[PDB]
């Protein structure tokens, strides 16, 4: 995020870091329950990647993070790689998350819920702060 | 480029797909929602993470960070997967697995 700010630690408890086997953060995701993470299809997650829950500071390993293996990747069959449309994948965890103060689920909308243009929302992540 | 160690946040507005198309044209599909162009931007490495809005007091997943400006321009809207267009598939997948 460019021109954002540091979050309060633990205050976005559904936010996960998707890391490859070398430990490199390559994408975010959101816990929707103890067993499932929602991410983008174009992130290309495989069962060799790791879901890291409970993280705040990726350079300080004093925190009680949960490194969760991925059992299966469910890329939405409607994903279109050419247009990046329907850009959603579900990750079924091999090991369930243990919900806590710093690890818990985001709500899903109903398909009929409305979010008007002009509404102020929030986005979070460990993406670049400057390109 | 700078990657942060610490989790970042930003507040930003939703756009309408019609207005987002002034920036992105026919690249915008019904299963996308735009947000930003407001002095902040999602950027590389944010993909897959949340765009949340409060609904009846609970943070609700409205978007999944997807794509946008290759330089993360803060005057151009970001594009997110529109979760209301995708939530039936989520529920079906969870039920079947």
């Amino acid at each position: 995020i460019v021109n954002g700010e540091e979050a309060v630690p633990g205050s976005w408890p559904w936010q996960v870091s998707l890391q490859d086997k070398t430990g490199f953060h390559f994408c975010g995701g959101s816990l929707i329950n103890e067993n499932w993470v929602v991410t983008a299809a174009h992130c290309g997650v495989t069962t060799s990647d790791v879901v890291v829950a409970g993280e705040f500071d990726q350079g300080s390993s004093s925190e009680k993070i949960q490194k969760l293996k991925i059992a299966k990747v469910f890329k939405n069959s409607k994903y279109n790689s050419l247009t990046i449309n329907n850009d959603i994948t579900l990750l079924k965890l091999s090991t369930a998350a243990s919900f806590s103060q710093t690890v818990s689920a985001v709500c899903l909308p109903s398909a009929s819920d409305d979010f008007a243009a002009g509404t102020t929302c929030v986005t979070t992540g460990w993406g670049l702060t400057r390109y | 480029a700078n990657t942060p160690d610490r989790l970042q946040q930003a507040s930003l507005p939703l756009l309408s797909n019609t207005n987002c198309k002034k920036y992105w044209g026919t690249k915008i599909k019904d299963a996308m929602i735009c947000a930003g162009a407001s002095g902040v931007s999602s950027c590389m490495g944010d993909s897959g993470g949340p765009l949340v809005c409060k609904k009846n007091g609970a943070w609700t997943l409205v978007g999944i960070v997807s794509w946008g400006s290759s330089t993360c321009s803060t005057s151009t809207p970001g594009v997110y997967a529109r979760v209301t267009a995708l939530v039936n598939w989520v529920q079906q997948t969870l039920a079947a697995n």
Binding site: A7, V8, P9, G10, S11, W12, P13, I32, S100, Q101, T102, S104, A105, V106, C107, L108, V122 | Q9, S11, V52, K55, G57, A58, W59, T60
Partner: peptide, 10 residues
Amino acid sequence: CGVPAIQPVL
């Protein structure tokens, strides 16, 4: 869902 135990500060 959606109600963090540690409240975000925006």
